[model samples]
Target: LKVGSESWWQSKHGPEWQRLNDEMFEVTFWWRDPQGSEEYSTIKRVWVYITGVTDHNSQPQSMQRIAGTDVWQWTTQLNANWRGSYCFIPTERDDIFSAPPDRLELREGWRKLLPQAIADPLNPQSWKGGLGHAVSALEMPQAPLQPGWDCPQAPEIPAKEIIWKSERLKNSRRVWIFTTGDVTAEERPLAVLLDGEFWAQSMPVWPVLTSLTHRQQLPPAVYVLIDAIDTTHRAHELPCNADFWLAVQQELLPLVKVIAPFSDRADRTVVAGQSFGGLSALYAGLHWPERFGCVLSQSGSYWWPHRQQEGVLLEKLKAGEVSAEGLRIVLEAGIREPMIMRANQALYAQLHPIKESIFWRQVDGGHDALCWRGGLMQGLIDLWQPLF
Candidate 1:
């Protein structure tokens, strides 16, 4: 009976848990029991060894556990020196059973057994059924910009250093100004690019921006880079305090217009940024729609201010205090990124009612430059497609 029970356990937990790496590489695993079962404990102990696989049936190439957590909640590092799978053993003991296997599999094939009802968390059919109201039709105006005008340079204007004042607190911020070709062109729109350091140096954004603009894939508009002087305080300033963003509307935009020539100060503008900067962009767009017409938030820190502040944002949005109408929002996050994935989904749910004003994308990649850079191109295309 014990032998049969052990076989059943192995069958139930056989194989191993699978997870893509930060780079989405496939990793294979084999595990065993290193310590024999203790006499009096009902707990099970297991150690898993893993290796990177180049081919399905090929010999395991040994590799060490890279310096991060794996999907299984195991602590043992992968063994070095072998391109093939490493070996480790864990013990399992059950008080109810007379004999238990010394090792247990970490991958319990439970997902396959989940009921259909429980598995479908967000049923699209159910959502459609809940759509009680008739859909309204509103014609959207043609987007600005014409195709085939590749990489046209912004019209030359005197660059000015503008100070961003935050009245909620006593700190002053600074940003460099660059106006699009002839802002004086009637109804010229504007865009503010936040996290200037990332847009300027940390990522390959400038080239992508240049391509999108030149290809006429994006609208012709002034691009303002808002520089962050003290990088350490970025998290605090970018999303935590809404008052700081208020300062941007009351202090920064007005001052920027005063200095730049050819800019139609009356035209509505866009706010854009990535990561934590992305959160700031959304906050600004939602809170100050009168000033910002659009937002491009890539991997936004919707989890900013942690759970507490996010709850506050949701409450405000629900109470009709934050009107998302007439605003265009682009939000994107990586599926493999566990940390902010839930937060992004929650925020999306809150914004779903205003579907026309919001766009969301889940891409493949982690929370790094590779993902954000790729997303930048997509974001620009969505926001800047030329309309007839």
Candidate 2:
């Protein structure tokens, strides 16, 4: 019976979803498309990404609507340890849902068709991700509070934008620089994060600086979020590769240090990256250890073992080429990630021996950004301890 007629649009679930209970809520999406007015006629499918169960670009469960009503009801659980973004798409726009969640990268065509995807008109609790991507948000009662995040409490700080000319990669890409406050005369700690555009535009890591500052537990640092240029270029730069590594070392780092008040000392730098960036972070640690003293590698693609298959790092560890004693590495992955979780453990076993202090965590959710937005802080906090 959840319908536009019942004023669900104006009710607790509309203009903003405030009807979140600790347990599962029987939610409904009312499709009032004028072109698809008739029940189950024009609107052939109602796909919902409820997250926790479904995820970013993951296959959405095909929902069934009432026999005669415009209401399409689905029972989604968002109970203990469940929280963060969700969205509903009811359409024949099959291309939008083309990629599965674990593929983790977007097709160029998917990017072009992204706007065609619709947000829920009935629910106002929504999240805007990187590249202006929007989706409805659902927070359960027991959901973990995203530490260092909350739009209202976040302090306002202006960010700078400029194109970084990389001679190594022969690419000119824009990078976003964020400093929490006035720059100190002394060199500050720096965290160079890859895929900078998405981090800045979507779930920002800027709040972590402000929140930790408010707590007087803040680490004096500068965040350099590097641009991937696009999906294709990102794949080229993020994986374990010689060219991208050269670009980051000879080109990217120099440019960032020259433009911003970023520290020159490698010991103070935290090379942060997620997904493939995470993989790259570890790769830098192994190959270019002097440049990255601490690696904040989250959900790293351990599945990518360079040539022969997964376990590149593992093989290196067994070969005794890589030592963990000197590396401050924080490894994390979502429990729902099949290969990622396996790779996380594989590397953990390798690294745990040489250094026992390496920070590590297993998230309850999936590979989606909503999970990363909050989980990133857990590692940051853990890494901050050594500095403290």
Candidate 3:
């Protein structure tokens, strides 16, 4: 039968796929019996946690088991060029998997279930995800190339660590600073990356930065990465917090300067982040234009303060107090995240009236690092292109 043949199992790496046409394909994700038994009784349920695809709902998509076989499978159609990360959550428990239709309840349910999710056994290519968990990666044939990711001998970029004790925000955290090479009399451009530890330890963005700089796609610059010590602290600091930005400008930049001298001018400084960091990056550009003039925001949480129809950021834009001039902006949001997409679109429209150098795009994935990391590199290149 189609379910269990030794040749079928060994024929290809999963999730198995069939090309339907030029633009789309039928992809099947499988969760076979762990013990290879027809009576695999331990797994009562299996859910596929495909980044950007499975996460937006209260009820995650479940893989259906074949009647008499040891296989459970879920199939979905995706664009040929789409790529993202995914994992399988096979659970024996029932109470935690199911959630009421309400949005908040569904979120709570996922919060409890996500820690147990595991990477696909069949997909050999995996990476450390945004949450610092290992997840299986998928790239369709037509997916856009991610620069500097496939190098086998990517050089490690060294970073110096410093403790940042912010008096304005009353928080102390470690900061990371890395430069292309020895600094001379010439001042290089400066970039501040939010959610620093993730890029530094988990994914290690230094190689990507180094590769792009070597290729001359990105200008040689000084990068400063800021840490979000905990969830509560990140939530408190990242969303339009002027005091946090103030601490960054008044305290963090001075500390970073002792190592390498970077341009303090707005046009030469970039602030970049994703999700909460994304929202904060734009906020820094808007409110502190004298400090950070370029913004690269990916999947920004524009729907802030309880996902209101008009978030506080949008309200600030409408008030006309902040000028969008002298700002180079790049906004990217995934199409799979409807609320975030809508908010970003709204923000773009609001910005279009007054801003001239704004680049906006909608990616085909979800709120995922698999998507954001690529966007991050591309955005820096785009934002810095004019200057070079």
Candidate 4:
């Protein structure tokens, strides 16, 4: 048993596990079937959904409820590098339980069934998800580990609120800043993570900072978590805009500096983000190379200059004579995500870092946080190495 009883619902087994293969993985699930309600009958269906590191909204694979047994199984050949969070959706009393696979038929009725979601009974790995819900987690055999994420836990430095009213974006937002208490270093770097409320507030980043610091993988510094109000707000600000960064420097940075005195120069500051946030991370380096020095981008939308018929953003950066020297760019993406992978490959060629100090050299898992975990760890490790 990995952490919980296998099926308190069925045979009451523990240690829900997956068999690893070179190419395909075999995942088996357990359910309480003392009376053969699911197998023999088509009144119910259990659908498994993978999120984060993989396509969350994509159609999920349905489990084959065993005819005579209490177990449900799903076997498929997926990329070995893929890792993500998953949950079980039991269509017990829904209209689509055994109906036709038509969208209109299941749209509104299925909406009601979503609120009654359940956590995985077999899996022990859990984390807080969007809107404060418990989420089940899954890791492939090759998933990278954040050294001290679980052990030597980070000291609970209180999270404080930062309210900034922006003149450029014409709005206001509340940011949460985590100030470290145990460090006494003189030159701690400043790393700003975008989508603050989304990524840093969650459990993923809390341990990442602590583990890296405790192990001396990162410099002693004050980390800022900047909020992205909502989906609409994120789209408007994240796409290659200088007004947002202007607000960041004038309105946001001063607030963070009030607590811990980070370096004032551009070389000591690190800006990190994912997806569109990922694209913006580098955009800061290219557009304002004098303000930000290191850029950490995970699955960045490198397909920039979308309206242009010519080249990509990185190529444009080179043509504009943006110096790569004194600047470090950490780029990561999933091989399965061809566009992202291709963009990173294109960037690697344009930037021309020797052996890619700009790239930590991992294809990683996917576009989700689960897959980005490795890239994040690798980037920090590469960029924030201890000073002698």
Q: Which numbered prediction scores highest in TM-score against the true structure?
A: 3
lDDT of 4 by residue, 3-103 (tens): 22244354443224455667555555554433454446543666555553324223334666656555566554444455666555666553443543444
List TM-score per model, in order: 0.55, 0.81, 0.87, 0.78
Which is better, 2 or 4, measured by lDDT? 2
lDDT winner among the candidates? 3
Q: Model 2, 79: alpha-carbon shift in Å? A: 4.3
Candidate 1 residue runs with Cα over 4 Å from true position: 1-169, 172-174, 181-184, 261-268, 307-310, 386-388
For all candidates in order, the CA lDDT equals 0.50, 0.67, 0.82, 0.65
List the candidates ranked by TM-score, beginning with the highest: 3, 2, 4, 1
RMSD of 4: 5.2
Better of 3 and 4 by TM-score: 3
- C-alpha positional error of residue 17 in candidate 2 after TM-score superposition, expressed in Å: 10
Candidate 2: RMSD to truth:
5.1
Model 3 misplacement above 4 A = 1-14, 31-41, 55-61, 64-73, 94-112, 131-133, 181-185
Minimum summed lDDT over a 10-residue window in model 2 is located at 9-18
Candidate 2 off by > 4 Å: 1-3, 12-36, 39-41, 55-61, 66-69, 93-117, 122-133, 151-156, 305-309
